[PDB]
């Protein structure tokens, strides 16, 4: 739906 | 049209260098290269099937490489729990059998509990053991890990002998086995240029 390519395949952690 | 091609060349080259760094235990370099790949993901890369496989492998490795940092999240879940989710996605999208990924699923789940125990996060270890190991592995290991948690017994051999280096090198070995062998176009051209 609204999922982006960057979201689906996120490599780096959202919170670090 | 042209940017997509170069973008894929660039992604594939940096994927190659990330594996090389991970395989050499150069995790500082791995993370720097990972951040470059992350920044590339917002640019047009072509048909999603041309890059899906390498990206899933890179996702799993990135979560494993952060596996000991419980102060880090890829999903609003500890890093090794995220890696478990990516492993399931790899099983489905790579058309693998349950048996082929079983031993790897086992390594990641055991690592997820043991890292929590090593950091003395007994409650997190207990919740992970119940979430991922209840419906898969053996009851004696579940019981052993439970009792290690109840007694906070980091001296137990299951904890003492666990090696994170060995764990993540084994994980790279399994993940790599599903990738094609083509050397990245950029690396080839660099050899010819130098």
Author numbering:
A (entry chain C): 322 to 337
B (entry chain A): 47 to 122, 126 to 185, 187 to 244
Excerpt from the publication:
MCPH1 plays important roles in DDR upon induction of double-strand breaks (DSBs). It contains two BRCA1 C-terminus (BRCT) domains at its C-terminus that mediate its interaction with the DNA damage marker γ-H2AX. The shelterin components TRF1 and the TRF2-RAP1 heterodimer specifically recognize double stranded telomeric repeats, while POT1 binds the single stranded (ss) 3’ overhang. A previous report showed that MCPH1 interacts with the TRF Homology (TRFH) domain of TRF2 and localizes at dysfunctional telomeres.
Analysis of the human MCPH1 amino acid sequence revealed the presence of a 330YRLSP334 sequence typical of the TRFH-binding motif (TBM) Y/F/H-X-L-X-P (where X is any amino acid) found in proteins that interact with TRF2, including Apollo/hSNM1B, PNUTS, SLX4, and NBS142–45. To understand the structural basis of this interaction, we solved the crystal structure of TRF2TRFH–MCPH1TBM complex at a resolution of 2.15 Å by molecular replacement. As predicted, the binding mode of MCPH1TBM to TRF2TRFH closely resembles the interaction between ApolloTBM and TRF2TRFH 43. MCPH1TBM binds to TRF2TRFH in an extended conformation with a short helix at the N-terminus across the concave face of each TRF2 subunit, and involves an extensive set of interactions, including both Van der Waals contacts and electrostatic polar interactions. The most critical interaction interface is the central portion of MCPH1TBM (330YRLSP334). MCPH1Y330 fits into a hydrophobic cleft formed by the aliphatic side chain of TRF2L101 and TRF2R102, and the hydroxyl group of MCPH1Y330 forms two hydrogen bonds with TRF2S98 and TRF2E94. MCPH1L332 is completely buried in a deep pocket surrounded by hydrophobic residues from α2 and α3 of TRF2, and MCPH1P334 stacks with the aromatic ring of TRF2F120. The backbone carbonyl of MCPH1R331 forms a hydrogen bond with TRF2R109. Isothermal titration calorimetry (ITC) confirmed the MCPH1TBM–TRF2TRFH interaction with an equilibrium dissociation constant (KD) of 0.24 μM. Mutating any one of the three conserved residues in the TRFH-interacting motif (Y330, L332, or P334) either completely abolished this interaction or greatly reduced it, confirming the importance of these hydrophobic contacts in  mediating the MCPH1TBM–TRF2TRFH interaction.
